[PDB]
Amino acid sequence: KFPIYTIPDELGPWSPIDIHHLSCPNNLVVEDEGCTNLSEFSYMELKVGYISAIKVNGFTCTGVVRPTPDACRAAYNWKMADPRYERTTKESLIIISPSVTDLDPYDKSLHSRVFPGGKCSGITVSSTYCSTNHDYTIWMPENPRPRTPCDIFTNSRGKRASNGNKTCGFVDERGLYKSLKGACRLKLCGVLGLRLMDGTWVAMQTSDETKWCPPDQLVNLHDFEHLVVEELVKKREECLDALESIMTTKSVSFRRLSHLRKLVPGFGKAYTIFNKTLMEADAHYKSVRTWNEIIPSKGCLKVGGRCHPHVNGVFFNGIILGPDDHVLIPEMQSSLLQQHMELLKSSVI
Amino acid sequence: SALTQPRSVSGSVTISCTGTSSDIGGYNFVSWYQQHPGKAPKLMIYDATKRPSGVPDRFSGSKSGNTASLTISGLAEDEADYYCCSYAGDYTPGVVFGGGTKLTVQLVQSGAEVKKPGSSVKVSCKAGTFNRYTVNWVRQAPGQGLEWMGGIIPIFGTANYAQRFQGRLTITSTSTAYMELSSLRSDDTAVYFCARENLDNSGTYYYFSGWFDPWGQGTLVTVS
């Protein structure tokens, strides 16, 4: 579930170290941190944090057996106010308007709460009631004219991360990262915003590359880790399985070095050995997809946009130039290719 | 093909605008505009059937969900092209326009400018009603139809640009608006106007719905 390889993107200083100084690869995913550009600005948010969570508060109003509309709202004014209404017996049919029951917006058409019947419809002047179970009880608003549909955003302060031409994630007034990474686009009453992987909705411009949130936005979960935290154990143990076999024998082999490759992009460290001196270098790692994009021609290793040079036919992370000029990558010649040249070496002072 | 208009109608005469689009919840805001030559379009119909609140003379506004309509009252000075403009709610960001109906019977800008290579051009648009307001910018290529490019809600400091012009456009106390292009490439050579929308309630409010009534005018830019 990891990238088949991780080729570096920018190597640098090559300094000498010994065995006692060997670290296993932080194989932890790190969010996009290249976006150091901190540009402050003002951005929109949903007033309540989340797409799912928003509500026009509301009431109910009963009937006689059907209720009437003009008074059921005029009854909502009194219950909050001029108090004009404040045996088994008979059905004594008159009205009452109990409240303190609200609702939530569902993102396509927004009128859903326990409402004996699933959903209702729209509540502009076209229809001034949302019938519910039976006929006895009728309406469910706060203000008679759509007050919440378009009047539920806010503005704020913050810093917009970015690299050069790509636009990066937010830093909030609460000091934290909220990234547009793998998000999706939502249009809210005209303004073009983005739902993040968290239900928090922003009104950021069309980032240079996104796709519309599907109608999979109702419970905010639907398509909604763990399996990855398992493999992290069983890989960064081969690192120490190998780090032990290098520490308890003073003898490295090019196979064992590959296990120290940072298996996921980001700022980690890169290792190789020329003869007897083990040496370290920092590198931002880049994901590899298939072997064809880094070994195109005889002896070549694509390092950004170049061919990395053969230094005695060894190249980093245990990649060596073999009998002919095939660049043989350890993990790649583990495609049913048995190759023996990479097994004996030593370490000193 | 976005909307639909008869290329021209001869003559009471009527123009249709099939393509009234109501989004996923129920909102529809066809808003018409008339274009005299070299003159900026004036708002003649908003919210399907309503007349412009200041000075209106022709009186017709119709809509049948799948069709909007416009029935002129008089039968010589009406002579012009006519365009419609509605909202759209799922995948599209702003407003759309028609394709020309040759009917047969205040603000400022930056001014006339030219550029040789695809480098930048910057327009100004001086002017406050104080209500909900979304300033925008529109493009008409030489003798073709209208084309919304992007918007800006100055209060929240957020801007919506369109898809064909994303990234190349950058729309932004003095009653002053602006507009910037990142690469002129000759296919964008056109005339550029500034306009906005100012209303309170959701009945005829969607941000960038088509209620462009404060209208600017006059940025004719040339690329080489």
Side-chain angles (χ1 to χ4, degrees), chain A residues 42 44 108 145-146 151 154-155 185 187 189-192 205-206 208 212, chain B residues 24-25 87-93 155-157 160 166 201-202 206-207:
Chain A
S42 301
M44 286 232 287
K108 285 271 262 181
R145 192 86 138 80
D151 178 12
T154 183
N155 189 356
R185 192 175 289 135
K187 192 150 148 283
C189 202
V191 51
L192 204 36
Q205 83 254 20
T206 38
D208 298 359
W212 296 89
Chain B
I24 47 175
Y87 183 70
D90 205 9
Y91 187 154
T92 41
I155 169 65
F156 294 95
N160 276 169
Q166 158 65 54
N201 205 220
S202 89
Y206 265 65
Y207 280 64

PDB file of all heavy atoms in Angstrom, chain A residues 42 44 108 145-146 151 154-155 185 187 189-192 205-206 208 212, chain B residues 24-25 87-93 155-157 160 166 201-202 206-207:
ATOM      1  N   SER A  42      -8.326  37.303   4.772  1.00  0.00           N
ATOM      2  CA  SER A  42      -9.649  37.084   5.340  1.00  0.00           C
ATOM      3  C   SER A  42     -10.383  36.042   4.507  1.00  0.00           C
ATOM      4  O   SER A  42     -10.397  36.125   3.275  1.00  0.00           O
ATOM      5  CB  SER A  42     -10.450  38.389   5.395  1.00  0.00           C
ATOM      6  OG  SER A  42      -9.788  39.369   6.177  1.00  0.00           O
ATOM      7  N   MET A  44     -13.893  33.086   4.339  1.00  0.00           N
ATOM      8  CA  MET A  44     -15.224  32.715   4.796  1.00  0.00           C
ATOM      9  C   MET A  44     -15.239  31.340   5.448  1.00  0.00           C
ATOM     10  O   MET A  44     -14.449  30.456   5.108  1.00  0.00           O
ATOM     11  CB  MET A  44     -16.224  32.718   3.641  1.00  0.00           C
ATOM     12  CG  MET A  44     -16.647  34.072   3.154  1.00  0.00           C
ATOM     13  SD  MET A  44     -18.443  34.163   3.135  1.00  0.00           S
ATOM     14  CE  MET A  44     -18.818  33.130   1.721  1.00  0.00           C
ATOM     15  N   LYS A 108     -28.732  19.002  -0.191  1.00  0.00           N
ATOM     16  CA  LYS A 108     -29.382  19.171  -1.486  1.00  0.00           C
ATOM     17  C   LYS A 108     -30.638  20.034  -1.346  1.00  0.00           C
ATOM     18  O   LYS A 108     -30.705  21.149  -1.877  1.00  0.00           O
ATOM     19  CB  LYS A 108     -29.689  17.791  -2.074  1.00  0.00           C
ATOM     20  CG  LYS A 108     -28.451  17.067  -2.627  1.00  0.00           C
ATOM     21  CD  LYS A 108     -28.192  17.405  -4.077  1.00  0.00           C
ATOM     22  CE  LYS A 108     -28.758  16.328  -4.991  1.00  0.00           C
ATOM     23  NZ  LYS A 108     -28.497  16.612  -6.428  1.00  0.00           N
ATOM     24  N   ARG A 145     -39.636  34.084   6.676  1.00  0.00           N
ATOM     25  CA  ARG A 145     -38.988  34.224   5.386  1.00  0.00           C
ATOM     26  C   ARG A 145     -37.575  33.648   5.472  1.00  0.00           C
ATOM     27  O   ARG A 145     -36.911  33.821   6.502  1.00  0.00           O
ATOM     28  CB  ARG A 145     -38.961  35.714   5.004  1.00  0.00           C
ATOM     29  CG  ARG A 145     -38.590  36.067   3.576  1.00  0.00           C
ATOM     30  CD  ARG A 145     -39.783  36.042   2.623  1.00  0.00           C
ATOM     31  NE  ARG A 145     -39.754  37.170   1.697  1.00  0.00           N
ATOM     32  CZ  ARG A 145     -39.015  37.224   0.596  1.00  0.00           C
ATOM     33  NH1 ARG A 145     -38.233  36.219   0.239  1.00  0.00           N
ATOM     34  NH2 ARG A 145     -39.057  38.317  -0.162  1.00  0.00           N
ATOM     35  N   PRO A 146     -37.090  32.931   4.429  1.00  0.00           N
ATOM     36  CA  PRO A 146     -35.808  32.212   4.558  1.00  0.00           C
ATOM     37  C   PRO A 146     -34.672  33.039   5.142  1.00  0.00           C
ATOM     38  O   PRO A 146     -33.997  33.790   4.431  1.00  0.00           O
ATOM     39  CB  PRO A 146     -35.503  31.782   3.117  1.00  0.00           C
ATOM     40  CG  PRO A 146     -36.819  31.740   2.447  1.00  0.00           C
ATOM     41  CD  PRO A 146     -37.654  32.813   3.072  1.00  0.00           C
ATOM     42  N   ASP A 151     -27.819  33.243   5.145  1.00  0.00           N
ATOM     43  CA  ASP A 151     -27.333  34.148   6.177  1.00  0.00           C
ATOM     44  C   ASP A 151     -26.643  33.344   7.283  1.00  0.00           C
ATOM     45  O   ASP A 151     -26.895  33.526   8.478  1.00  0.00           O
ATOM     46  CB  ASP A 151     -28.494  34.999   6.698  1.00  0.00           C
ATOM     47  CG  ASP A 151     -28.100  35.954   7.809  1.00  0.00           C
ATOM     48  OD1 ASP A 151     -26.888  36.147   8.038  1.00  0.00           O
ATOM     49  OD2 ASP A 151     -29.007  36.498   8.473  1.00  0.00           O
ATOM     50  N   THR A 154     -19.581  33.409   7.931  1.00  0.00           N
ATOM     51  CA  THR A 154     -18.805  34.348   8.728  1.00  0.00           C
ATOM     52  C   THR A 154     -17.484  34.617   8.021  1.00  0.00           C
ATOM     53  O   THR A 154     -17.074  33.879   7.122  1.00  0.00           O
ATOM     54  CB  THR A 154     -18.554  33.817  10.145  1.00  0.00           C
ATOM     55  OG1 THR A 154     -17.843  34.801  10.906  1.00  0.00           O
ATOM     56  CG2 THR A 154     -17.721  32.543  10.091  1.00  0.00           C
ATOM     57  N   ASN A 155     -16.825  35.695   8.432  1.00  0.00           N
ATOM     58  CA  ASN A 155     -15.484  36.036   7.982  1.00  0.00           C
ATOM     59  C   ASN A 155     -14.528  35.867   9.158  1.00  0.00           C
ATOM     60  O   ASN A 155     -14.951  35.772  10.312  1.00  0.00           O
ATOM     61  CB  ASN A 155     -15.449  37.472   7.430  1.00  0.00           C
ATOM     62  CG  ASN A 155     -14.133  37.816   6.739  1.00  0.00           C
ATOM     63  OD1 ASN A 155     -13.194  37.020   6.725  1.00  0.00           O
ATOM     64  ND2 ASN A 155     -14.065  39.013   6.161  1.00  0.00           N
ATOM     65  N   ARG A 185     -15.503  20.167  -3.827  1.00  0.00           N
ATOM     66  CA  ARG A 185     -16.064  21.490  -4.061  1.00  0.00           C
ATOM     67  C   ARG A 185     -17.567  21.508  -3.810  1.00  0.00           C
ATOM     68  O   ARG A 185     -18.292  20.596  -4.224  1.00  0.00           O
ATOM     69  CB  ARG A 185     -15.779  21.943  -5.494  1.00  0.00           C
ATOM     70  CG  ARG A 185     -16.054  23.414  -5.759  1.00  0.00           C
ATOM     71  CD  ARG A 185     -15.624  23.803  -7.167  1.00  0.00           C
ATOM     72  NE  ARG A 185     -14.175  23.833  -7.321  1.00  0.00           N
ATOM     73  CZ  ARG A 185     -13.522  23.306  -8.348  1.00  0.00           C
ATOM     74  NH1 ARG A 185     -14.161  22.701  -9.337  1.00  0.00           N
ATOM     75  NH2 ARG A 185     -12.195  23.381  -8.380  1.00  0.00           N
ATOM     76  N   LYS A 187     -20.922  24.475  -3.739  1.00  0.00           N
ATOM     77  CA  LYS A 187     -21.418  25.826  -3.990  1.00  0.00           C
ATOM     78  C   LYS A 187     -22.570  26.115  -3.031  1.00  0.00           C
ATOM     79  O   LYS A 187     -23.610  25.449  -3.080  1.00  0.00           O
ATOM     80  CB  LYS A 187     -21.850  25.985  -5.445  1.00  0.00           C
ATOM     81  CG  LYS A 187     -22.101  27.424  -5.841  1.00  0.00           C
ATOM     82  CD  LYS A 187     -21.823  27.667  -7.303  1.00  0.00           C
ATOM     83  CE  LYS A 187     -22.744  28.746  -7.821  1.00  0.00           C
ATOM     84  NZ  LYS A 187     -24.080  28.149  -8.034  1.00  0.00           N
ATOM     85  N   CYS A 189     -25.170  28.795  -1.863  1.00  0.00           N
ATOM     86  CA  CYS A 189     -25.943  30.015  -2.086  1.00  0.00           C
ATOM     87  C   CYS A 189     -25.154  31.020  -2.925  1.00  0.00           C
ATOM     88  O   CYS A 189     -25.184  32.232  -2.692  1.00  0.00           O
ATOM     89  CB  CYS A 189     -26.395  30.641  -0.765  1.00  0.00           C
ATOM     90  SG  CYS A 189     -27.838  31.738  -0.941  1.00  0.00           S
ATOM     91  N   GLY A 190     -24.435  30.498  -3.919  1.00  0.00           N
ATOM     92  CA  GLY A 190     -23.767  31.298  -4.908  1.00  0.00           C
ATOM     93  C   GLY A 190     -22.257  31.323  -4.794  1.00  0.00           C
ATOM     94  O   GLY A 190     -21.572  31.391  -5.822  1.00  0.00           O
ATOM     95  N   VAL A 191     -21.719  31.279  -3.580  1.00  0.00           N
ATOM     96  CA  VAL A 191     -20.277  31.370  -3.384  1.00  0.00           C
ATOM     97  C   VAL A 191     -19.672  29.984  -3.545  1.00  0.00           C
ATOM     98  O   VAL A 191     -20.228  28.984  -3.074  1.00  0.00           O
ATOM     99  CB  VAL A 191     -19.934  31.973  -2.008  1.00  0.00           C
ATOM    100  CG1 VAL A 191     -20.685  31.258  -0.907  1.00  0.00           C
ATOM    101  CG2 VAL A 191     -18.433  31.933  -1.762  1.00  0.00           C
ATOM    102  N   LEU A 192     -18.525  29.921  -4.214  1.00  0.00           N
ATOM    103  CA  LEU A 192     -17.884  28.650  -4.533  1.00  0.00           C
ATOM    104  C   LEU A 192     -16.895  28.294  -3.433  1.00  0.00           C
ATOM    105  O   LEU A 192     -15.794  28.844  -3.366  1.00  0.00           O
ATOM    106  CB  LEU A 192     -17.206  28.727  -5.894  1.00  0.00           C
ATOM    107  CG  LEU A 192     -17.024  27.367  -6.555  1.00  0.00           C
ATOM    108  CD1 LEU A 192     -18.214  26.502  -6.227  1.00  0.00           C
ATOM    109  CD2 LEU A 192     -16.908  27.535  -8.046  1.00  0.00           C
ATOM    110  N   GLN A 205     -11.484  30.129  -3.079  1.00  0.00           N
ATOM    111  CA  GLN A 205     -11.660  30.113  -4.519  1.00  0.00           C
ATOM    112  C   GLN A 205     -11.457  28.698  -5.044  1.00  0.00           C
ATOM    113  O   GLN A 205     -10.868  27.835  -4.381  1.00  0.00           O
ATOM    114  CB  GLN A 205     -10.670  31.048  -5.219  1.00  0.00           C
ATOM    115  CG  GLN A 205      -9.285  30.437  -5.455  1.00  0.00           C
ATOM    116  CD  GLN A 205      -8.211  30.977  -4.533  1.00  0.00           C
ATOM    117  OE1 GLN A 205      -8.501  31.536  -3.477  1.00  0.00           O
ATOM    118  NE2 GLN A 205      -6.954  30.808  -4.932  1.00  0.00           N
ATOM    119  N   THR A 206     -11.972  28.458  -6.245  1.00  0.00           N
ATOM    120  CA  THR A 206     -11.626  27.234  -6.948  1.00  0.00           C
ATOM    121  C   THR A 206     -10.121  27.063  -6.894  1.00  0.00           C
ATOM    122  O   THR A 206      -9.389  27.716  -7.647  1.00  0.00           O
ATOM    123  CB  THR A 206     -12.092  27.263  -8.404  1.00  0.00           C
ATOM    124  OG1 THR A 206     -11.914  28.581  -8.937  1.00  0.00           O
ATOM    125  CG2 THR A 206     -13.536  26.870  -8.498  1.00  0.00           C
ATOM    126  N   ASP A 208      -6.703  25.334  -7.774  1.00  0.00           N
ATOM    127  CA  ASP A 208      -6.329  25.038  -9.152  1.00  0.00           C
ATOM    128  C   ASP A 208      -6.791  23.649  -9.598  1.00  0.00           C
ATOM    129  O   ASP A 208      -6.917  23.414 -10.806  1.00  0.00           O
ATOM    130  CB  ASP A 208      -4.811  25.189  -9.309  1.00  0.00           C
ATOM    131  CG  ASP A 208      -4.325  26.612  -9.017  1.00  0.00           C
ATOM    132  OD1 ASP A 208      -5.165  27.482  -8.704  1.00  0.00           O
ATOM    133  OD2 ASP A 208      -3.106  26.866  -9.131  1.00  0.00           O
ATOM    134  N   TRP A 212     -16.115  18.178  -7.541  1.00  0.00           N
ATOM    135  CA  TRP A 212     -17.314  18.452  -6.762  1.00  0.00           C
ATOM    136  C   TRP A 212     -17.613  17.347  -5.766  1.00  0.00           C
ATOM    137  O   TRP A 212     -17.522  16.156  -6.084  1.00  0.00           O
ATOM    138  CB  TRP A 212     -18.499  18.642  -7.696  1.00  0.00           C
ATOM    139  CG  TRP A 212     -18.273  19.814  -8.506  1.00  0.00           C
ATOM    140  CD1 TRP A 212     -17.629  19.866  -9.699  1.00  0.00           C
ATOM    141  CD2 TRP A 212     -18.601  21.156  -8.159  1.00  0.00           C
ATOM    142  NE1 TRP A 212     -17.561  21.158 -10.138  1.00  0.00           N
ATOM    143  CE2 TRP A 212     -18.156  21.973  -9.210  1.00  0.00           C
ATOM    144  CE3 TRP A 212     -19.244  21.747  -7.070  1.00  0.00           C
ATOM    145  CZ2 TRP A 212     -18.328  23.346  -9.205  1.00  0.00           C
ATOM    146  CZ3 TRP A 212     -19.415  23.114  -7.067  1.00  0.00           C
ATOM    147  CH2 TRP A 212     -18.970  23.896  -8.136  1.00  0.00           C
TER     148      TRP A 212
ATOM    149  N   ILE B  24     -30.487  22.518  -7.244  1.00  0.00           N
ATOM    150  CA  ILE B  24     -30.910  21.259  -6.635  1.00  0.00           C
ATOM    151  C   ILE B  24     -32.007  21.490  -5.595  1.00  0.00           C
ATOM    152  O   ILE B  24     -33.036  20.800  -5.594  1.00  0.00           O
ATOM    153  CB  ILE B  24     -29.678  20.531  -6.068  1.00  0.00           C
ATOM    154  CG1 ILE B  24     -28.818  21.508  -5.259  1.00  0.00           C
ATOM    155  CG2 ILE B  24     -28.869  19.919  -7.214  1.00  0.00           C
ATOM    156  CD1 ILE B  24     -27.642  20.865  -4.567  1.00  0.00           C
ATOM    157  N   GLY B  25     -31.804  22.458  -4.700  1.00  0.00           N
ATOM    158  CA  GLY B  25     -32.919  23.131  -4.082  1.00  0.00           C
ATOM    159  C   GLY B  25     -33.568  24.047  -5.100  1.00  0.00           C
ATOM    160  O   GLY B  25     -33.045  24.274  -6.180  1.00  0.00           O
ATOM    161  N   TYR B  87     -29.146  31.965 -12.920  1.00  0.00           N
ATOM    162  CA  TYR B  87     -28.272  31.302 -11.968  1.00  0.00           C
ATOM    163  C   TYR B  87     -28.051  29.848 -12.388  1.00  0.00           C
ATOM    164  O   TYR B  87     -28.695  29.334 -13.305  1.00  0.00           O
ATOM    165  CB  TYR B  87     -28.877  31.388 -10.565  1.00  0.00           C
ATOM    166  CG  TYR B  87     -28.034  30.804  -9.454  1.00  0.00           C
ATOM    167  CD1 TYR B  87     -26.852  31.412  -9.051  1.00  0.00           C
ATOM    168  CD2 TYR B  87     -28.425  29.638  -8.809  1.00  0.00           C
ATOM    169  CE1 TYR B  87     -26.084  30.873  -8.030  1.00  0.00           C
ATOM    170  CE2 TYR B  87     -27.666  29.091  -7.793  1.00  0.00           C
ATOM    171  CZ  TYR B  87     -26.499  29.712  -7.404  1.00  0.00           C
ATOM    172  OH  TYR B  87     -25.745  29.162  -6.390  1.00  0.00           O
ATOM    173  N   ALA B  88     -27.112  29.191 -11.707  1.00  0.00           N
ATOM    174  CA  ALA B  88     -26.862  27.766 -11.878  1.00  0.00           C
ATOM    175  C   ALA B  88     -26.120  27.270 -10.643  1.00  0.00           C
ATOM    176  O   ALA B  88     -25.214  27.946 -10.151  1.00  0.00           O
ATOM    177  CB  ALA B  88     -26.065  27.487 -13.154  1.00  0.00           C
ATOM    178  N   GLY B  89     -26.500  26.095 -10.149  1.00  0.00           N
ATOM    179  CA  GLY B  89     -26.199  25.789  -8.764  1.00  0.00           C
ATOM    180  C   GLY B  89     -25.326  24.606  -8.405  1.00  0.00           C
ATOM    181  O   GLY B  89     -24.886  24.507  -7.256  1.00  0.00           O
ATOM    182  N   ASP B  90     -25.060  23.692  -9.330  1.00  0.00           N
ATOM    183  CA  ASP B  90     -24.313  22.522  -8.893  1.00  0.00           C
ATOM    184  C   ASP B  90     -22.846  22.637  -9.279  1.00  0.00           C
ATOM    185  O   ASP B  90     -21.983  22.733  -8.404  1.00  0.00           O
ATOM    186  CB  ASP B  90     -24.915  21.239  -9.454  1.00  0.00           C
ATOM    187  CG  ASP B  90     -24.597  20.034  -8.591  1.00  0.00           C
ATOM    188  OD1 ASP B  90     -24.056  20.224  -7.477  1.00  0.00           O
ATOM    189  OD2 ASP B  90     -24.878  18.899  -9.026  1.00  0.00           O
ATOM    190  N   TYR B  91     -22.554  22.641 -10.576  1.00  0.00           N
ATOM    191  CA  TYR B  91     -21.180  22.645 -11.055  1.00  0.00           C
ATOM    192  C   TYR B  91     -20.753  24.032 -11.541  1.00  0.00           C
ATOM    193  O   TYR B  91     -19.557  24.329 -11.563  1.00  0.00           O
ATOM    194  CB  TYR B  91     -21.042  21.555 -12.155  1.00  0.00           C
ATOM    195  CG  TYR B  91     -19.667  21.203 -12.762  1.00  0.00           C
ATOM    196  CD1 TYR B  91     -19.447  19.936 -13.302  1.00  0.00           C
ATOM    197  CD2 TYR B  91     -18.594  22.084 -12.756  1.00  0.00           C
ATOM    198  CE1 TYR B  91     -18.212  19.579 -13.844  1.00  0.00           C
ATOM    199  CE2 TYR B  91     -17.362  21.739 -13.297  1.00  0.00           C
ATOM    200  CZ  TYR B  91     -17.173  20.487 -13.836  1.00  0.00           C
ATOM    201  OH  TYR B  91     -15.942  20.161 -14.366  1.00  0.00           O
ATOM    202  N   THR B  92     -21.679  24.916 -11.837  1.00  0.00           N
ATOM    203  CA  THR B  92     -21.176  26.163 -12.393  1.00  0.00           C
ATOM    204  C   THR B  92     -21.194  27.297 -11.362  1.00  0.00           C
ATOM    205  O   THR B  92     -22.022  27.298 -10.447  1.00  0.00           O
ATOM    206  CB  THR B  92     -21.996  26.528 -13.632  1.00  0.00           C
ATOM    207  OG1 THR B  92     -23.376  26.265 -13.371  1.00  0.00           O
ATOM    208  CG2 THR B  92     -21.556  25.668 -14.801  1.00  0.00           C
ATOM    209  N   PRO B  93     -20.276  28.287 -11.482  1.00  0.00           N
ATOM    210  CA  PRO B  93     -20.019  29.203 -10.359  1.00  0.00           C
ATOM    211  C   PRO B  93     -20.744  30.542 -10.390  1.00  0.00           C
ATOM    212  O   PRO B  93     -20.894  31.176  -9.342  1.00  0.00           O
ATOM    213  CB  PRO B  93     -18.503  29.419 -10.453  1.00  0.00           C
ATOM    214  CG  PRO B  93     -18.150  29.151 -11.919  1.00  0.00           C
ATOM    215  CD  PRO B  93     -19.373  28.577 -12.607  1.00  0.00           C
ATOM    216  N   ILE B 155     -16.980  42.519   1.400  1.00  0.00           N
ATOM    217  CA  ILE B 155     -17.120  42.415   2.852  1.00  0.00           C
ATOM    218  C   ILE B 155     -16.312  41.236   3.387  1.00  0.00           C
ATOM    219  O   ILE B 155     -15.450  41.394   4.261  1.00  0.00           O
ATOM    220  CB  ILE B 155     -18.607  42.326   3.248  1.00  0.00           C
ATOM    221  CG1 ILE B 155     -18.766  41.936   4.723  1.00  0.00           C
ATOM    222  CG2 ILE B 155     -19.382  41.403   2.304  1.00  0.00           C
ATOM    223  CD1 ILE B 155     -18.228  42.960   5.701  1.00  0.00           C
ATOM    224  N   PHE B 156     -16.557  40.043   2.850  1.00  0.00           N
ATOM    225  CA  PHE B 156     -15.857  38.854   3.315  1.00  0.00           C
ATOM    226  C   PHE B 156     -14.472  38.697   2.698  1.00  0.00           C
ATOM    227  O   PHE B 156     -13.723  37.808   3.120  1.00  0.00           O
ATOM    228  CB  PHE B 156     -16.706  37.611   3.031  1.00  0.00           C
ATOM    229  CG  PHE B 156     -17.990  37.552   3.824  1.00  0.00           C
ATOM    230  CD1 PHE B 156     -19.182  38.013   3.282  1.00  0.00           C
ATOM    231  CD2 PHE B 156     -18.005  37.038   5.111  1.00  0.00           C
ATOM    232  CE1 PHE B 156     -20.364  37.961   4.013  1.00  0.00           C
ATOM    233  CE2 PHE B 156     -19.182  36.982   5.846  1.00  0.00           C
ATOM    234  CZ  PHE B 156     -20.363  37.444   5.294  1.00  0.00           C
ATOM    235  N   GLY B 157     -14.111  39.533   1.728  1.00  0.00           N
ATOM    236  CA  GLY B 157     -12.812  39.411   1.087  1.00  0.00           C
ATOM    237  C   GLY B 157     -12.614  38.106   0.347  1.00  0.00           C
ATOM    238  O   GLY B 157     -11.506  37.553   0.355  1.00  0.00           O
ATOM    239  N   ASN B 160     -14.867  34.783  -6.447  1.00  0.00           N
ATOM    240  CA  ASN B 160     -15.195  33.633  -7.285  1.00  0.00           C
ATOM    241  C   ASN B 160     -14.847  33.968  -8.730  1.00  0.00           C
ATOM    242  O   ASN B 160     -15.478  34.837  -9.337  1.00  0.00           O
ATOM    243  CB  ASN B 160     -16.674  33.256  -7.170  1.00  0.00           C
ATOM    244  CG  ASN B 160     -16.968  32.373  -5.972  1.00  0.00           C
ATOM    245  OD1 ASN B 160     -18.126  32.146  -5.628  1.00  0.00           O
ATOM    246  ND2 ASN B 160     -15.919  31.866  -5.336  1.00  0.00           N
ATOM    247  N   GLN B 166      -9.706  30.540 -14.730  1.00  0.00           N
ATOM    248  CA  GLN B 166      -9.194  30.293 -13.387  1.00  0.00           C
ATOM    249  C   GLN B 166      -7.673  30.382 -13.361  1.00  0.00           C
ATOM    250  O   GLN B 166      -6.995  29.850 -14.243  1.00  0.00           O
ATOM    251  CB  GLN B 166      -9.657  28.922 -12.894  1.00  0.00           C
ATOM    252  CG  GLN B 166      -8.798  28.313 -11.791  1.00  0.00           C
ATOM    253  CD  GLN B 166      -8.838  29.115 -10.507  1.00  0.00           C
ATOM    254  OE1 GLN B 166      -9.907  29.392  -9.971  1.00  0.00           O
ATOM    255  NE2 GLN B 166      -7.665  29.479  -9.999  1.00  0.00           N
ATOM    256  N   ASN B 201     -32.351  39.809   1.028  1.00  0.00           N
ATOM    257  CA  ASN B 201     -32.960  38.544   1.410  1.00  0.00           C
ATOM    258  C   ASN B 201     -32.868  37.495   0.307  1.00  0.00           C
ATOM    259  O   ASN B 201     -32.807  37.806  -0.883  1.00  0.00           O
ATOM    260  CB  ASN B 201     -34.419  38.756   1.794  1.00  0.00           C
ATOM    261  CG  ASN B 201     -34.922  37.695   2.722  1.00  0.00           C
ATOM    262  OD1 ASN B 201     -36.051  37.242   2.599  1.00  0.00           O
ATOM    263  ND2 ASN B 201     -34.078  37.280   3.658  1.00  0.00           N
ATOM    264  N   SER B 202     -32.916  36.226   0.735  1.00  0.00           N
ATOM    265  CA  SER B 202     -32.662  35.089  -0.146  1.00  0.00           C
ATOM    266  C   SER B 202     -33.690  34.944  -1.260  1.00  0.00           C
ATOM    267  O   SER B 202     -33.460  34.159  -2.187  1.00  0.00           O
ATOM    268  CB  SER B 202     -32.637  33.795   0.666  1.00  0.00           C
ATOM    269  OG  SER B 202     -33.940  33.245   0.772  1.00  0.00           O
ATOM    270  N   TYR B 206     -28.963  34.934  -4.543  1.00  0.00           N
ATOM    271  CA  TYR B 206     -27.880  33.971  -4.503  1.00  0.00           C
ATOM    272  C   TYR B 206     -26.629  34.743  -4.890  1.00  0.00           C
ATOM    273  O   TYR B 206     -26.683  35.604  -5.771  1.00  0.00           O
ATOM    274  CB  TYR B 206     -28.134  32.803  -5.449  1.00  0.00           C
ATOM    275  CG  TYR B 206     -28.779  31.611  -4.776  1.00  0.00           C
ATOM    276  CD1 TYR B 206     -30.058  31.697  -4.248  1.00  0.00           C
ATOM    277  CD2 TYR B 206     -28.119  30.397  -4.689  1.00  0.00           C
ATOM    278  CE1 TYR B 206     -30.656  30.612  -3.637  1.00  0.00           C
ATOM    279  CE2 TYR B 206     -28.708  29.303  -4.084  1.00  0.00           C
ATOM    280  CZ  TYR B 206     -29.976  29.417  -3.559  1.00  0.00           C
ATOM    281  OH  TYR B 206     -30.564  28.331  -2.955  1.00  0.00           O
ATOM    282  N   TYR B 207     -25.522  34.490  -4.201  1.00  0.00           N
ATOM    283  CA  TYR B 207     -24.309  35.247  -4.492  1.00  0.00           C
ATOM    284  C   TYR B 207     -23.908  35.043  -5.948  1.00  0.00           C
ATOM    285  O   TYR B 207     -23.741  33.909  -6.404  1.00  0.00           O
ATOM    286  CB  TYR B 207     -23.181  34.838  -3.546  1.00  0.00           C
ATOM    287  CG  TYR B 207     -23.276  35.497  -2.186  1.00  0.00           C
ATOM    288  CD1 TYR B 207     -24.350  35.242  -1.345  1.00  0.00           C
ATOM    289  CD2 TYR B 207     -22.296  36.379  -1.746  1.00  0.00           C
ATOM    290  CE1 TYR B 207     -24.448  35.845  -0.102  1.00  0.00           C
ATOM    291  CE2 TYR B 207     -22.384  36.986  -0.502  1.00  0.00           C
ATOM    292  CZ  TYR B 207     -23.463  36.714   0.315  1.00  0.00           C
ATOM    293  OH  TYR B 207     -23.566  37.311   1.552  1.00  0.00           O
TER     294      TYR B 207
END
